[PDB]
Symmetry: D2
Subunit: 122 residues, 4 copies
């Protein structure tokens, strides 16, 4: 599903995920968040299962954004973990972890969890 | 903290995380899990905050492994989200999400969550 | 929102959440899962914010089910953490953690994470 | 493990978890957080597996605190999901989800995730 994953994806917040899937399992591209301490595009990298099951299962993948670019630095990183489901209404269904750099005193409150659904439309 | 992050790290399960931190914010290397459906080394990639706060906060980072190599394919991916804390007893404190490719019927049970602490010794 | 929370709720899997909100912050009732190692109703208990903000924010709440009843014992517990949002299309938006009892060797894989949205219809 | 669970527990932050396990699977008691927007004791309720496996597995359990008492209201709730492991150095190993009431605009950032280990000493 190199073909299926490569392209522009949009989540429910109106963020934009631009990815290229490599034959080797690499994910490379850019992320633009519609929310939070973010402006314009950020580098992303990650990995995907390049030889998924042929039993109708989804394709496991994940990626990371560190929220530093030429405009802003939010001293934080998000990782999305999820699966690509192909077909007419293709989706990437994810859960994510957003960690901030903190002092040791605040480290118990370092990490947000959430979930994003990406589609090829909107 | 390019210097501080680059190297070999070990978690509480005895897994081995071999990483290089690029000046640009890139993380590249290999992961070897002591547990689960895993043998030998797997590619990893990720990102880190290459200009962290100077107030004693940690350095945000994350990375992904897709559990496919030349030996095995577990049809799954893990993402670690966390922060690097420098000093005498350097640590990377993480939380992780492990997603399997599933059928739509089993997708509610696709994702494990856990936490790993990495040190430079053991 | 004692009135708003008390009643029958349904999630996206077709599970049924029957709850009573007490004036004191208590949640009591029963849960019936449409999926997994579950049959019929299980006891639940939890808590909610009985004096929420008046700025349009949601109402924080959570509850637990241990997956033991007179029919089955799945040696596991789920906790839902989320917020109640009132109005014409009332919702409870949650994230959950499902922990199994495990051996120490398997404890790294003890816990699933997911998300459920509850509505008063369907 | 009604006997094993009932009592006073302490986590790595120095919080105090005072619980009674009922023969029926109930957990009732009080929680006092050493960190965050919290003072003194808060009600908790939850559930546990009252007939755990006899193969050395842990005992699944969970509980909720809504962060309202007579002193403060943090408009938030935490759920802990975990397992009790008996013996010389008894532990409750948990992961938790802390949800705040938010506006719909901030709901993506409503929930923290973390992990607490409780012991009978300290």
């Amino acid at each position: 599903d190199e073909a299926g994953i490569t392209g522009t994806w949009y989540n429910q917040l109106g963020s934009t995920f631009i990815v290229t899937a490599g034959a080797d399992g690499a994910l490379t591209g850019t992320y633009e968040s519609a929310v939070g301490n973010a402006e314009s595009r950020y580098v992303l990298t990650g990995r995907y299962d390049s030889a998924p099951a042929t039993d109708g299962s989804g394709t496991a993948l994940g990626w990371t954004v560190a929220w530093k670019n030429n405009y802003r630095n939010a001293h934080s990183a998000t990782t999305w973990s999820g699966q690509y489901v192909g077909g007419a209404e293709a989706r990437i269904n994810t859960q994510w972890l957003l960690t901030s750099g903190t002092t040791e005193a605040n480290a118990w409150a370092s990490t947000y969890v959430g979930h994003d659904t990406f589609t090829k439309v909107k």
